[PDB]
Amino acid sequence: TYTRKKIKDIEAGDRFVEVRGTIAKVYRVLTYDACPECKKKVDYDEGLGVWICPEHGEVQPIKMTILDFGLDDGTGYIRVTLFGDDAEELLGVSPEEIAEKIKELEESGLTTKEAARKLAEDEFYNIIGREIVVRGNVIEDRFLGLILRASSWEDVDYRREIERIKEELEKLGVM
Amino acid sequence: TYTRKKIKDIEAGDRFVEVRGTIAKVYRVLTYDACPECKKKVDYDEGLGVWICPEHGEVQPIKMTILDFGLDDGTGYIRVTLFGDDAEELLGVSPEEIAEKIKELEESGLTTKEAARKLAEDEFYNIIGREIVVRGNVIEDRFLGLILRASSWEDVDYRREIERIKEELEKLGVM
Amino acid sequence: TYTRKKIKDIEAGDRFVEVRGTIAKVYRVLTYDACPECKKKVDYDEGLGVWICPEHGEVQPIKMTILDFGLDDGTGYIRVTLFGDDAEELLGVSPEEIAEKIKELEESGLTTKEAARKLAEDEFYNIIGREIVVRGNVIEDRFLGLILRASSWEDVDYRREIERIKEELEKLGVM
Amino acid sequence: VATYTRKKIKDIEAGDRFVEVRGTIAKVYRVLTYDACPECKKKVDYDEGLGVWICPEHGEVQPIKMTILDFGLDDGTGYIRVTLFGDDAEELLGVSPEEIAEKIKELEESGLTTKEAARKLAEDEFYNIIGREIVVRGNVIEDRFLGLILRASSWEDVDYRREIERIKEELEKLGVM
Amino acid sequence: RRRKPAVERKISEIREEDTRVSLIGRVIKVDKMDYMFWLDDGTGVAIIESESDLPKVGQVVRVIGRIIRNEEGIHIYAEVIQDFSDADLEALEEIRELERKLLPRLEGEIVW
Amino acid sequence: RRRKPAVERKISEIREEDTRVSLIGRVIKVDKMDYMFWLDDGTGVAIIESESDLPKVGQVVRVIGRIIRNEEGIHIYAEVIQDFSDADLEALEEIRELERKLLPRLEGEIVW
Amino acid sequence: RRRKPAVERKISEIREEDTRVSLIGRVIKVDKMDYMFWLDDGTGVAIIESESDLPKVGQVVRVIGRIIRNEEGIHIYAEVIQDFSDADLEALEEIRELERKLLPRLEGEIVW
Amino acid sequence: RKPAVERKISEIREEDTRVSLIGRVIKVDKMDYMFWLDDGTGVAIIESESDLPKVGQVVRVIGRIIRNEEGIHIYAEVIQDFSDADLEALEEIRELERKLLPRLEGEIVW
Amino acid sequence: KKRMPATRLYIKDILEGYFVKSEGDFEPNYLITKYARKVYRAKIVGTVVREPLIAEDETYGKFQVDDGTGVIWVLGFRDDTKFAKLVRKGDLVQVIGKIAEWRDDKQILVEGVSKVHPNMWILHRYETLKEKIEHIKKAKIALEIYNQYGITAKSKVIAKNKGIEEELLEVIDELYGIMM
Amino acid sequence: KKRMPATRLYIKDILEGYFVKSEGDFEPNYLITKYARKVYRAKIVGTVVREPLIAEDETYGKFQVDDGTGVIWVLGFRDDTKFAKLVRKGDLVQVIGKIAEWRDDKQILVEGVSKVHPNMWILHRYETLKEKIEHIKKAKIALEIYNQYGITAKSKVIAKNKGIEEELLEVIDELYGIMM
Amino acid sequence: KKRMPATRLYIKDILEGYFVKSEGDFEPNYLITKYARKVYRAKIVGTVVREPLIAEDETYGKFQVDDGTGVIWVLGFRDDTKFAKLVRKGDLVQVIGKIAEWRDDKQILVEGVSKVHPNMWILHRYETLKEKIEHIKKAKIALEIYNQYGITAKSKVIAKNKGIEEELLEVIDELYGIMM
Amino acid sequence: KKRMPATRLYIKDILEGYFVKSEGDFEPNYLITKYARKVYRAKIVGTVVREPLIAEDETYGKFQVDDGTGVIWVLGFRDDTKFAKLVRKGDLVQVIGKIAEWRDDKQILVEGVSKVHPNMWILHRYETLKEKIEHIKKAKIALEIYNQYGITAKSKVIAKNKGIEEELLEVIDELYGIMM
Ligand SMILES: [Zn+2]
Ligand SMILES: [Zn+2]
Ligand SMILES: [Zn+2]
Ligand SMILES: [Zn+2]
């Protein structure tokens, strides 16, 4: 399944990693089209004028969300990436609203990245400071270093963390 | 109760009269000694070395200020005299300060009257042009003419004055 | 001829009086036309449209100067009127120049007396304070008081005044 | 007598002598005062066991208070620390050493050490000299813990026509005028 | 070139010939980056520009200022701002009306 | 309503579209009853109308002022008056000329 | 302290306590090299320092000015020179002695 | 300012000024704005300003003691719900911190 | 020992009246307004529009006052320059003082200046209008008496029994003689 | 309508006099000298000592006058500044004008300045000495009568009988009133 | 591109810590607590005690935080004022931000505020205690090495062998220098 | 501890550059002008056009500066508000400080302000013009190297032997990446 790991010891190429932390910075919010069967990126062919998905033939794509933010737990800082319905659940805003807002921002004369960053820093600034437990895989990007791509996130279980910290206190040797 | 009268119709010997006007000159300001119970003029005896207040026996002198100015209200000009703490309130300076200033002027070789006049005309010149309402009784001094001995003074109530002027205009026959 | 008289003792109807004093105020300077040979006022008769002198027939008028000023001595103040060439000698300005100055002043919108007063108080202010001797006759005007109409004037003589005040000093009894 | 030489802050190195630098005051580090001989104006030592000040040039002398100023100079191509001694310090600041000593004493009476009192005095009362153009002269030394330091002998105000002449000459070298 | 007195006017009736005016209103919005405020006395809104000082929002002021009439608009350049917070405005308007209805007739009476 | 810079200009070269100008001149006449002075810099004379302060006669000043253009005429409403009595004017005009002849070409160089 | 009045004296009676001198006298010699001239009152000759104006021989003159007492000599730092060509000097002398006789008694009498 | 300190109502100290309580409501008086809090060791009448708790809702209150002749009542400032809570860990951590703080703060030097 | 009371005026009337300068010692200067009113001392309320100008050696001091009908200079020479320091720009003052003329332009020689509350300004407006109307009526009544009859011992009796002050006929005649 | 005459003084009499300022409107300011003389307008003769200082805007103009007895300031404000331009330093002038006080120092408010000749200056000295002597003897005559009864009807009658002008009694009365 | 992770503290650790502000451009300000811990970003949990005071032009916004050991100011300038709008008085918040000093009193420049549940607060207390204990024992075992030799290569090697992080030696040295 | 020198700039360039905000801790914010110049600190000379605005509780202070090509706001927060009190309207100041952006308008966070003589203003003009010319020439030379070849070690060698700083190529690359 998933293996618990500390941010201090995260290394590239690791798989099935569980981290707990708090959100410290939000970088990007974006939406883009994907296949309605495998939820995978579809290529808009100029010669055909349609969105081809080279695993199910021609399909009609649907919008899905991508979120880029940062996690900290007191021992390190890791940039993390959240996908699809998890981002909608975390943010609480339906994806079509994000799409409409980002087109409205880009209509003023901003590129895709500028609109994404402005939208992240101007509306979804209220999620940072909140705790989150992420499960995912560690990838290395040549320009950004370590990125934890989270398959899913689930709220912190207080009792499990309390018993973990108590057992670590026993390892310390107070009781 | 007091009666409001215009300065044009002020006659000698009238009592309990109230006058509205503007301060047009400052004649004198000075200090003297009075009883600490009745606030009345007391006599210091050189041969006895004490102050005698013949309802009070021997008492410790206290400082009382006299202010002497002139009031104008478009129809006449009349002298007004204020006593004690009312002059302290109107001038805003404690009587001990006036006493020490007049002492300092007297140490220059100037008589009492001249020192009082210079103090009035060189330090308290900023009250000229102030609009007030005084109350008191009128007396006829053989060397000065009419004098109004103020018992209390107050500030103008502008709404009542507007009411009075409106009533006068109504009697005239415009409104 | 002419008899000395103190200003304090000048009375109405007195004749042939000379005084010595100092100019204290200039009232007016004007010019008007007169008969060229006997020096008398000529009337511009509207019935004939000509200047008539009703003692010598028709004449061509010439301009002459009139000057009203004030003389003082230390014992009193009197008004003095000079006529014609005397004013020209005292001032040093030919009557025609006064004439154009008056008409320029009038063209601005001022009456004859206003122009006279303006000219007297604006350009002829430099004769005040000079010593002079006036000789003439005292007349009484109902609304103006005593006017010493001067027949002639001269610069004050010094030796005669010094000897007169010396004999007055001898009368005092110092030497 | 050796003459001084203009030199850009960019290319000055440790151990150089007689360097002249024009710049703007960008930070005030410290202002302090201490005792010195009243004749040779040199550091004298007060001995606790002897209770006197000893000048190793004149014997026993009565101490006189002189101030030291420590600031930073910037001229578009670099940033360098500068230290001013004695008379020039109160000439630049405009406050006699007695007042500085009294203020340091009052600061230390609040429980602050020497360094903290000096820094608070510099940053709380003499902050109005930042942004002033000056031309300093002195010798550049290298302190093992602070880097390059320019110890100044004298300072003067600029001279708006000579500087314009220099800029015109440099523009002529570029080839526009 | 005697300076003209401040001709006291309401916002709705600022005529074209005016070069200096004196208005009384209450502040409704203040912009500090541009140093402007909006004056509203019931019959209109005027964008009053200021040089160095601004009033607070919600208080009644009296503003004496010039007129700058260009194609950019018509904005009043405030010169003197006075705090009229506790003045009786109804009595002021009554006396303004009475003065306006009486004085033009009064000057006509008497002759030479 | 962005604030406009003081477009530095000569007296003889004041355009029609200017709204704020900065002049340098010397005073030749001052009128204290009306609070005005005459600024003369060699190529013209401008009637500068102050608000509260006046300079002396014969000293060189620099005036930053808002231009008021009505049918009455053209007159500069001084806002900031600075004393440039001991300034170097020849070097100032030389640098103004150099900047004017160089800067318009500079912006064209380089691309993106 | 107010400015002192002038005191008039003769050459032979120049007192040490006198401060400013008024003299009436005769020119006998003028030296333009040092701007100096000799003045004769009859009882002596005094050297007078003219600043810019110089009298003529044959013109009797009156000088008001300052005395300079140094080790080199006694010369009068003249301030004003005026023509008295015509003058009753005897009357001036008689009134001077008459005043010196009566004024000291006049002031003493009449108490308050 | 004075930090808020938490105890039991039966162990209220005269020297202490600001109090933090976690307790059980039994009754409430609207007209006087009183209500009763029970922490298991005693009952305290505490004065809510305008909020009013419900019976069955465990309440944590931050307030100030008003030791007058009228009784012992708490000038409550903060009222919050703790009905979904554990506290055994609360006494555990309070006693742990109390036991090890005095030596820990005295440990080491400069 | 008599002092004439000060009248409350519009600045327009001060600027449009005729200034009569006395020649004797025992008479003061005065001003006759367009509706035959002699005024010795003026008393106005208005806004200071400019910072006071005080000479470098405090010989004199002045400031401008505006009230909505005209703008007038207020001066003080020698030791009255102290008054010029009691006010600054934008204040709402009340000024009492004499009337003087200099270079065909009326000016006030200040005797006192003092700040007031806006309600005092409204009182100034009410009172000045009310006391203008009264004198307008009285002068309108007395003008007919002067025109029909003139100055006769019986004209004084008629004015006495009609309720009109005696001096009003004299000031009307003076105005006629000055503006003729 | 009465211009009561100016009087001739020494400078010290003006400087060491008693300045009495009036309070009523119909009374002018005056001076009471040491020997009980009432002075309204001074008329002095003397030489000018320094350059006339005049304001660049010609609002005020003042200069110094010296005659050997003291230094006196001659001033002219507003319109009178023209007189300050008539003089040059180093000449003898006759100055006629009023007396006023500023910063406990006497000064003359100018009304007329004229260039003069030295012989009329010695005539000035003659006249002032003679008038001083005459008033001194009159005051000496009046002193004992004042000290006899005071200001009573009998005293007035006897003063009239032996030939003393009545106002002297009041002048010494005011002098005694102000000395205390 | 490296961000130093925020560390969890009590309020008292911040209040009597030592503020060290850097002078170079490439170094941030920091804090050294009493027991020699280097702190860059604070991360506190506590209840709010007073209403958020925010300027009407929303340039600045600040509020108070209390948990049981002290009262700290949480500030936001210019753009950050939005955070001061997210809170209401009475609730428990987690605040993450930087440390800065103004008028001899520490304060936190906000970077993020989030409302939270009490069990998180108790977990916060647990984590603070755990972090305090480990570092206090590490400082205790490093004190012997520091007082033994100092900052030397042999001392660094023996500290590495004993398992003590190197930077503690320099932190101890800087704290020792700050004390004297 | 390295501090970067301040560059003398036109206000127009400050208002027309691209503001790059750092994300790490050990890097400061900066601004890239239209001609590929990285600036950390600005230093301008100009006229204060308005009275400084200081909050009632002295938490911040600001003033406007104009030099001829633009008008910029200068700010100071917390204890730097003291600087906002050193100047008044009409001054000719020199301001040194960092560059910040708020609501898409560039502003300067003040570190020092000080009055100067007009000759200093003329030096500012000369020296800023020369400093612009030099960098324009260098960037024009380096742009061709960037475009023809790219980012390689051999391109770095070419730039080294051509007399162009190494960092300029990276600055041009960043400008291209931000303007794409
Ligand atoms: Zn698919
Ligand atoms: Zn008693
Ligand atoms: Zn004839
Ligand atoms: Zn030595």
Numbering used by the authors:
A (entry chain J), B (entry chain G), C (entry chain D): 184 to 358
D (entry chain A): 182 to 358
E (entry chain I), F (entry chain C), G (entry chain F): 6 to 117
H (entry chain L): 8 to 117
I (entry chain H), J (entry chain E), K (entry chain K), L (entry chain B): 2 to 181
Give excerpts from the publication:
To decipher the molecular basis of PabRPA oligomerization in the absence of DNA, the structure of the PabRPA tetrameric supercomplex was determined by cryo-EM at 3.4 Å resolution. The PabRPA tetrameric supercomplex is formed by two dimers (AB and CD) arranged in a C2-symmetrical assembly, which interact through contacts involving their Tri-Cs. Interactions within the AB and CD dimers involve their OB-3 domains, while the two dimers are held together by interactions involving their OB-4 domains. The Rpa1 N-terminal domains are flexible and were not modeled in our 3.4 Å cryo-EM map. This unanticipated oligomerization mechanism is strikingly different from that observed in ssDNA-PabRPA complexes, which involve OB-1 domain. Notably, many surface residues in the interface that stabilize the PabRPA tetrameric assembly are also found to bind ssDNA. Indeed, most contacts within the AB and CD dimers involve the α1-β1 β-hairpin of OB-3 domain, which also make extensive contacts with ssDNA. Consequently, the Tri-C DNA-binding groove, which provides the main contribution to DNA binding in PabRPA, is almost completely occluded in the PabRPA tetrameric supercomplex. Therefore, dissociation of the PabRPA tetrameric oligomer is required for the Tri-C to bind ssDNA. Consistently, upon addition of a poly-dT25 ssDNA substrate, the PabRPA tetramer is dissociated to DNA-bound dimers and monomers.
